[PDB]
Amino acid sequence: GNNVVVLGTQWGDEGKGKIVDLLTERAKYVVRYQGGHNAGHTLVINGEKTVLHLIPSGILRENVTSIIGNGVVLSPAALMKEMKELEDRGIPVRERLLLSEACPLILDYHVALDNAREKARGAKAIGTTGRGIGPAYEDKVARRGLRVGDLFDKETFAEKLKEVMEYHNFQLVNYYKAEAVDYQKVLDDTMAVADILTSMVVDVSDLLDQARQRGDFVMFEGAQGTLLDIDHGTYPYVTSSNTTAGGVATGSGLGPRYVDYVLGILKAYSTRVGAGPFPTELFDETGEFLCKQGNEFGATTGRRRRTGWLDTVAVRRAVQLNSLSGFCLTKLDVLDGLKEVKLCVAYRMPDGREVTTTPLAADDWKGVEPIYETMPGWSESTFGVKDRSGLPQAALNYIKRIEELTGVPIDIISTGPDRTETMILRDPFDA
Amino acid sequence: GNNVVVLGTQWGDEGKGKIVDLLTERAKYVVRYQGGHNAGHTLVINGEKTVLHLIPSGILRENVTSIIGNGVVLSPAALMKEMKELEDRGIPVRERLLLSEACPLILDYHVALDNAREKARGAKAIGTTGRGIGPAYEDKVARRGLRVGDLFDKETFAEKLKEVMEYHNFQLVNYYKAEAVDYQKVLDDTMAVADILTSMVVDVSDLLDQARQRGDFVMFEGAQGTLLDIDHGTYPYVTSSNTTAGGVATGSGLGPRYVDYVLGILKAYSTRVGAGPFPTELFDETGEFLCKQGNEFGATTGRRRRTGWLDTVAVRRAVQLNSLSGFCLTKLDVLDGLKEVKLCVAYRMPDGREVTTTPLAADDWKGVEPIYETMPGWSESTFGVKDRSGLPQAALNYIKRIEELTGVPIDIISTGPDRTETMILRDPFDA
Ligand SMILES: O=c1[nH]cnc2c1ncn2[C@@H]1O[C@H](COP(=O)(O)O)[C@@H](O)[C@H]1O
Ligand SMILES: O=c1[nH]cnc2c1ncn2[C@@H]1O[C@H](COP(=O)(O)O)[C@@H](O)[C@H]1O
Incomplete structure (x- = not known):
């Protein structure tokens, strides 16, 4: 199969990372279709470890173009942090990495909220990674979530961020009786990274369409495992994203019919x-x-x-x-x-x-x-x-x-x- | 193809309803994989109209078992209302209709919230159907949304509803300065329908798996059109659900590979x-x-x-x-x-x-x-x-x-x- 998929059966930690890498020795592309910075796909080449969270496990390969689809939650801070670490190790990330115009954004309040909510539940504590994943997916569907494309106009951006933040703050201070998460800092922090980010942006839907008609080996990489699936998992003690192989076409943009093989770790x-x-x-x-x-x-x-x-x-x-x-x-x-x-x-x-x-x-x-x-x-x-x-x-x-x-x-x-x-x-x- | 899909290309209203019916003359199953009660698939058999919102357009057929997958938002009131109307017309709904253990529930506050939010936006009013769809999808991913399966234990149910409702009410009265949506009535209204509902419940994932190995003609039916897709649509002036053909495997439970033909209206x-x-x-x-x-x-x-x-x-x-x-x-x-x-x-x-x-x-x-x-x-x-x-x-x-x-x-x-x-x-x- 040209279009091979690789995802986890159990509750994650099957070993997706090692497998994508090892398998990608012929891959043009490599796509993350869902998740946020909650995964920890580990690679060990000739003896040297690498722990990829948000960055596709195809990053350690010249030929492979690693992408992150619309189905991903992206924490700006998170990306840049993984970037630096990979750069200092010799990996030309900015050159290899691609990313969606549609990926909703994970700012700090998304961590703030996640933090707050997990508290209220007291005993029935799910066990979230503390990486604000849930709230971003939330705002996303709510249709108030800021996405990568919004960065393409800093003017209006801070206007939206102003509202979004106020709203999320009303409940932080009034409901959960927490501390207001400061807008300005959010903006400063977010603006000091936009150009770097917005530079790797692409129309990943059409990309996959193209690759397909050419016959490019493509490998999708899943975060987490099936039993944690938002829809089909042990709800609600699960993740807020469709970790199932249906996430591919929804998270990347590629049509469901073009999947040629699902590899369950x-x-x-x-x-x-x-x-x-x-x-x-x-x-x-x-x-x-x-x-x-x-x-x-x-x-x-x-x-x-x-x-x-x-x-x-x-x-x-x-x-x-x-x-x-x-x-x-x-x-x-x-x-x-x-x-x-x-x-x-x-x-x-x-x-x-x-x-x-x-x-x-x-x-x-x-x-x-x-x-x-x-x-x-x-x-x-x-x-x-x-x-x-x-x-x-x-x-x-x-x-x-x-x-x-x-x-x-x-x-x-x-x-x-x-x-x-x-x-x-x-x-x-x-x- | 045994597994044929039928969804909309434009911004909906292509005419999915008529097409599913007309096509299902050999269909064992018929599945709604996403949406809520915002669609209006119309049928006209020999001259008699039928306007199906939440009920699969395969309902007007004896041989066809109409199902509604995990990817659907279900308003109890809504279902029962469509049930009565179809019953009084001679359609044995309760016998034909099947439905997911996993479908999150749409109660009144989900309308309340939807209502409130659309107001705050003032000018930039999306144009929602007023059917609480967005908020249910929200709570769903938030992991606080009540689902059909929760009805399988009225005891604990009202406990959860108590919390869920309080929370959603704090912002209704304090933030939006609206009116508290009464818990008790919600419960009364919801309990007077549980047994009827919970009776049609099924494991639709395994159903589809089975049908497939037998070779049963199955037809999925989509609500809305692609350009309104939560992920790939003209965001945020879109719907909160993946109206794309990737919704099938995420909304029903069936594996992506088993799709044999996507029919775009x-x-x-x-x-x-x-x-x-x-x-x-x-x-x-x-x-x-x-x-x-x-x-x-x-x-x-x-x-x-x-x-x-x-x-x-x-x-x-x-x-x-x-x-x-x-x-x-x-x-x-x-x-x-x-x-x-x-x-x-x-x-x-x-x-x-x-x-x-x-x-x-x-x-x-x-x-x-x-x-x-x-x-x-x-x-x-x-x-x-x-x-x-x-x-x-x-x-x-x-x-x-x-x-x-x-x-x-x-x-x-x-x-x-x-x-x-x-x-x-x-x-x-x-x-
Ligand atoms: O990659 C993963 N490995 C292990 N547990 C995970 C992973 N991703 C999410 N979780 C679990 O999924 C649940 C929900 O957390 P969330 O993804 O931060 O919202 C928590 O129980 C985490 O254990
Ligand atoms: O079946 C449909 N036909 C036409 N417009 C729809 C349909 N479903 C949702 N919408 C549009 O999708 C948008 C979001 O509304 P929602 O689905 O109620 O949350 C609104 O602009 C509605 O116009």
């Missing part, structure tokens, strides 16, 4: 950060062990991630929703040393029902229970193997099973953070 | 209701004439629609965005009697540039001008013709041209509101 175990239902969770040794064995802390907020076994019931929702074509199995090595690995084949509802289908909203997960299928483990190390035959039959079997339990082929295995600690049995871009 | 002239940029607008005889000749008043609010010639520059944005496969040409008969019909082939930017590509945001349309291509008209009547050879060469040519100017084939022509006043040269469901 699948972490060999489960992890969740932020509050919400996590059926297969663990609080025993294996729980902490998985947290340790795979360095499980939120690559943006540092929050220690929760562990559990690969929930196959959950995966299957993803499989249908995102129309997978194959699976990218990441983190196998974390399972090394276990005496036994077990996955979840079905749910036992709180009323006695056994089922292989999932509950929607958060409430509906209230008493669900994991029904496993324990398989042997392995003391052998699968770390860095790049050939199937370097995987012991046990682990080999764990793969065979997951293909069956899903009907989706695991076209890629990954034995490490480093781009070369990967095994490719089926390349998205050519089949 | 194309009205033979242009119309716009609500404020915003309308390049090809008319204020002369032809302007009022088109308003008269095609009964141009908003089928929900009664608002007289604005007229103009078919803007081919605009259409082409739609063509690329929604990945059209063909065109449904509606309202040809309105052009009867004209001495000459002219369409718009390109834009003359306010700086001198000639271009066949469109501006995004509303501001960016500030001085754009229509560059026509006048073709002869026709005194012959094309009203009700059902054969191509009943169309005079002039009108025939107008079709040939639009296929060229777009590269998209006009697979369907429509000579009247009535289902049988149609000509089909290519059926979506079988090619």
